[PDB]
Design an enzyme around this catalytic site. Structure first.
Site, PDB file in Angstrom:
ATOM      1  N   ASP A   1       1.000  -1.160  -0.046  1.00 63.83           N
ATOM      2  CA  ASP A   1      -0.054   0.051   0.015  1.00 63.83           C
ATOM      3  C   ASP A   1       1.019   0.935  -0.163  1.00 63.83           C
ATOM      4  OD1 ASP A   1      -1.808  -1.943   0.611  1.00 63.83           O
ATOM      5  OD2 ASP A   1      -2.476  -1.343   2.105  1.00 63.83           O
TER       6      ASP A   1
ATOM      7  N   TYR B   1      32.710  10.427  16.061  1.00 66.11           N
ATOM      8  CA  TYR B   1      31.850  11.818  15.958  1.00 66.11           C
ATOM      9  C   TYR B   1      32.976  12.710  16.685  1.00 66.11           C
ATOM     10  CZ  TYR B   1      28.623   8.438  14.466  1.00 66.11           C
ATOM     11  OH  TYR B   1      28.240   7.378  13.722  1.00 66.11           O
TER      12      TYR B   1
END
Lengths: 679, 679
Positions: free
Chosen positions: A110, A315
């Site tokens: 869908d 990071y």
């Protein structure tokens, strides 16, 4: 060791799910029938070894919802938890304690209409959102935006999933091949090929992400107990030494720093272990390092948790704290004993900062047979005291002290203190907690304030209501029933809010200067041991400097003799061979000089380098140096250098030490300003 | 100048659509009602100046299709064409001739179910897929994968649309801010915010993509007619000179090369113009450069179209053709006259390769009052002839020749040729075309073979059927009716297949050595003009080299005099001031020497540099050079250098020229091998 799932009949568990490798497994969650078939198809390509699959079917008609229904959602969540092995990892940790290291969702047939994806993400976000941050913990099947086929250099295809990737490839590589693109929207009713591609791709990637994992008595205690003098443990010393090695004057990721540090220091532990150490050295929340030698440029951990909420090595970035070089003075580097391993040489046996770093930052550790704990002290005190020892005056007493902290410490018996936070009564039955005893984490309090609010079993709740307005400080506002407020006066406000913690000096142990594990019996015992060796080394530094100056004075001296002997014709070089002219120099006593500037005075026979030197300092001089002005200048330099040597010799070891302490005091004022300013 | 759309009532044209800036406009195509509302919402944020919008509504129930219906699709396509201004750009061109420079699709409410996207892309792909390749011609509304909010350094948010972007940011920037992420699946029933974000983002990006646009008689002819000698036009000379300037020994994008070339050569035309020129210099398909000085590392254009299908400057790379430096010999660089502009100096007035590049590659150009066209010739012939002029022998005649080509050329009247391709009759009524006359593009034939097959109006079709099996060659297999085959014998096989083209030498014009526009009357007239100047310059080269050697010989000579005069005590430097000792040197005749090694013999008074020099070559020598072995060596060098000078002087200009031609011949054999090998 397979933890096995028994209550979920529809689960097709990965062969390695719930084992040592469970973190390397992806649990493919599917939505509706068609999603499952597709999953299965993608599954056929990658194997069932590292991939599990569990379906949450359904659908129905519409896109609507008004009458509710959650008995389902609740249980669907449960399944994912049990299956993945959640409720089994402690928040902030990593993926190792889980059955599955990833979660891929398959939504289809869908509209995206993923009643799931939303729910999944949502629940992930309000339950263990720490997971949700991990690299590629969450995965989603997506179809390629463009496929590329290559005819010539080799023969292969490339699937792109976003313009940036395609575009970077087009600009950086396309030109090296003959190829044609294939915009995506060339398919009938079969995503089977595309789902197979996704899986093939995903597996190929994870096979790389997961390949990148970056008697006992002596070994342990060595790696577990700090060496007084510098206050480090081998692991931290290697990082510091490493930072000093490549010139750390601008940031780089701690994930780039770790391999470098390990390489040059032959570290025998996980690169993950090192990164942790680098992070420890850089932490700067209230209660960590009084002086952090490494600068935390990124989320390095926060007070609220005691630094376990530090981000990932790739990071965050560090750099040398500008002050670090005023503590570990570069001029002492040549005086250290650099340990040898294989054929390298690593970090020193120990460093010797200008002040006992072990008292500045303190240390803690548990090894076999031995244990340690030394709280932190005020650098400014340590200095006043080093100066007492210097002027032979009585030492003043030192009490634990924390940078940026604002509670109060009290000594009960010598060697024992009680540390207090701060709690005021801001109104009739409203208490404002403005400080926690140092090392007592902001969350451990909230957790306990929450258990006394919504009194969860154990015993009855006792707070009317609690509010948390933490700025860069600590402010828990507590409101109590007139009956409970008065009960807290009986037990004591600080004792009831857990606002007290003890500091014991009963176990201050560290390796002394000759590797022996000593238990010191006072701050002052530690400071003195250090003072004596540091003082000696300042002598060693002085000597090392005076010796280089001596050699300079020697070289200039002989250059002057030479030019003189030539200018006033006692020495003639004009002709005569090499050997003759160099031997005749040896006889006149002129020393050779190597490249470090060290003179040599003996017979250079037998196997003759850099071990002896040459007369290059004489013969290699220019013809210009026989002229008047040059010669005059040559004499002027000799004298200035002789004067330089004298002046140095007129400074006591202490004179130098203090010249250094002063420099530190300046930089430490700046350091404190900058450190508070960012808070 | 607004071309206006009149037949499409539902179109909301951009204010600048169909104008000078039409290429900067995005035509937002929407699918269904909800898509339109959303478009409109995104539209409100960006303005109607550069954005148009046209809806293709519909939907219905299901996802099914069996009974057909295309009256719609056909017309929907028409609209997009008219509206965008398609059928108005020539294939391979760029976006400038269109009403709109982009096409964004908005597909929504249901499953992606874009009956559109597929159709759009599909039709784009089989109609003018050249557009489909342009950077971001095609756009699509997509929702962000993750949003990021930043509290501190400033205050702003970042929307990411794929992990790679987020991940690169997380690793490279995150650490510089305090921020929290926000995984996407936190929305009710309103994409309005997300569509506004997309547009805001898109506009912000295009405002950058489109900001990056990277009497007349003399000016034109200068930039339009080549200079014989090197065969270039100012534009190409600047590129070559530029490549020689930064050392082009490894590739770089032609988009990086152009700005560099323009910078150092103050180019007054579009950077796009230069990139084109760089590409022209690098082309290597059959019919372009006989010798491409620049190496085409990427799609630089193909034979089939004559190079208009070259890729974009940012995806292709060039480098100096390894042979280029054997043609433009580095030793002549100091002999050129580098034109001055402002306060720089640019490319030479002209270069002087070792062979007339203008005959090797030929040239073509149209300027005001003057026109030119010189075909290419065989380098190997050019050389045999330069050698004839060298040994004063008659010149042999030269006929146009193309690298890698295999047809045949025939001279009819002197100055005129007819060039043939190749067409054999492989079977009773099946013809195989294996070569086209050079410069006749593979497509221009196919186009015409297609018009004679599916005889589209004009007059009746005439081919039964045509097949195209082109490998790295040319092979069109034609099958004709027994009646048409015999009609082709009447008109002639080559004439009917357009397999003949003429080559006229009637207009060979180029600026001669002193800027005057000359019309040469023979290959040989051109070769000779060149020969005489080249020969002179080889003298100039010889002189320039002998002069440096002379200066070296002079310097060593005086160093020897000096050391001698000192060693055998006729000169004493031991003491006496500077001035005294340097003046006394001037009197003995010793010249000064500057840094390029040029000696000076005069009085250095008044305002005294690098204009005169110093006696640094004497006094700056080491004491070592007064010893025996050094002095002996010093004499040995003087002699070897004197010998070096003599030997050079024993070579005639021609000796040198030929030493160069030979080197080229070797490299040109390699060049041809490598060039064919890749074909």
């Amino acid at each position: 060791r397979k933890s096995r799932i028994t209550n979920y009949p529809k689960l097709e568990d990965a062969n390695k799910a719930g084992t040592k490798e469970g973190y390397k497994c992806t649990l493919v969650l599917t939505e509706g029938d068609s999603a499952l078939s597709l999953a299965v198809a993608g599954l056929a390509v990658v194997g069932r070894d590292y991939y599990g699959c569990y379906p949450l079917r359904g659908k129905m008609l519409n896109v609507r919802e008004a009458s509710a229904d959650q008995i389902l959602k609740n249980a669907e969540i449960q399944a994912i938890k049990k299956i993945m092995g959640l409720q089994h990892r402690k928040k902030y940790e990593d993926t190792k304690s889980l059955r599955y290291g990833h979660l891929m969702i398959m939504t289809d047939q869908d509209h995206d209409g993923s009643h799931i994806k939303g729910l999944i993400i949502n629940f992930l976000e309000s339950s263990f959102l720490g997971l949700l941050d991990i690299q590629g913990f969450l995965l989603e099947f997506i179809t390629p935006i463009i496929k590329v086929s290559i005819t010539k250099p080799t023969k292969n295809t490339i699937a792109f999933y976003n313009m940036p990737d395609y575009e970077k490839w087009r600009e950086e590589e396309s030109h090296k091949f003959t190829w044609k693109q294939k915009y995506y929207k060339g398919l009938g009713t079969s995503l089977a090929q595309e789902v197979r591609e996704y899986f093939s791709n995903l597996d190929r990637h994870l096979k790389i992400f997961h390949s990148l994992q970056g008697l006992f008595s002596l070994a342990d205690n060595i790696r577990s107990i700090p060496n007084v003098l510098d206050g480090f443990k081998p692991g931290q010393r290697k990082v510091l030494y490493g930072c000093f090695k490549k010139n750390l004057k601008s940031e780089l990721k701690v994930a780039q720093l770790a391999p470098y540090v390990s390489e040059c220091t032959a570290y025998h532990h996980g690169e993950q272990s090192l990164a942790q150490t680098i992070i420890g050295l850089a932490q700067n929340f209230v209660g960590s390092n009084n002086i952090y030698l490494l600068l935390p440029n990124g989320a390095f951990g926060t007070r609220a948790t005691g630094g376990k909420d530090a981000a990932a090595a790739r990071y965050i970035y560090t750099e040398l704290n500008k002050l670090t070089r005023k503590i570990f003075h570069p001029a002492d580097d040549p005086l250290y004993k650099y340990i040898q391993e294989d054929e390298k040489t690593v970090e020193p046996e120990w460093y010797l900062p200008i002040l006992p770093m072990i008292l500045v930052n303190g240390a803690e550790g548990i090894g076999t047979g031995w244990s340690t704990y030394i709280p932190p002290f005020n650098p400014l005190e340590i200095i006043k005291n080093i100066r007492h020892l210097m002027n032979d005056e009585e030492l003043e007493q030192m009490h634990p002290w924390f940078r940026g902290w604002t509670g109060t410490i009290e000594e009960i018996e010598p060697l024992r203190y009680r540390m207090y936070g701060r709690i005021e009564q801001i109104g009739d039955n409203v208490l404002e907690i403005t400080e926690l005893p140092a090392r007592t984490w902001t969350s451990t309090i909230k957790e306990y304030l929450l258990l006394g609010l919504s009194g969860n079993d154990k015993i009855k709740p006792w707070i009317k209501d609690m509010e948390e307005q933490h700025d860069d400080n600590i402010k828990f506002i507590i409101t109590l029933s007139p009956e409970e407020m008065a009960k807290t006066r009986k037990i004591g406000f600080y004792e009831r809010f857990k606002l007290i913690s003890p500091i014991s000096l009963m176990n201050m142990v560290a390796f002394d200067p000759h590797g022996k594990i000593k238990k010191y019996n006072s701050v002052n015992e530690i400071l003195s041991e250090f003072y004596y060796v540091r003082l000696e080394y300042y002598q060693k530094r002085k000597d090392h400097m005076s010796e280089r100056l001596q050699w300079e004075v020697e070289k200039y001296s002989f250059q002057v003799k030479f030019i003189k002997m030539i200018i006033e014709k006692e020495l003639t070089v004009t002709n005569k061979p090499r050997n003759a002219i160099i031997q005749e120099l040896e006889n006149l006593g002129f020393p050779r000089f190597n490249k470090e500037g060290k003179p040599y005075y003996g017979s250079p026979n037998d196997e003759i380098e850099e071990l002896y030197g040459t007369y290059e300092y004489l013969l290699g001089m220019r013809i210009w140096s026989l002229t008047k002005e040059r010669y005059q200048k040559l004499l002027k330099q000799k004298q200035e250098k002789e004067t330089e040597l004298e002046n140095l010799l007129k400074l006591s070891a202490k004179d130098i030490w203090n010249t250094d302490l002063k420099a530190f005091e300046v930089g430490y004022q700046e350091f404190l300003q900058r450190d508070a300013e960012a808070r």
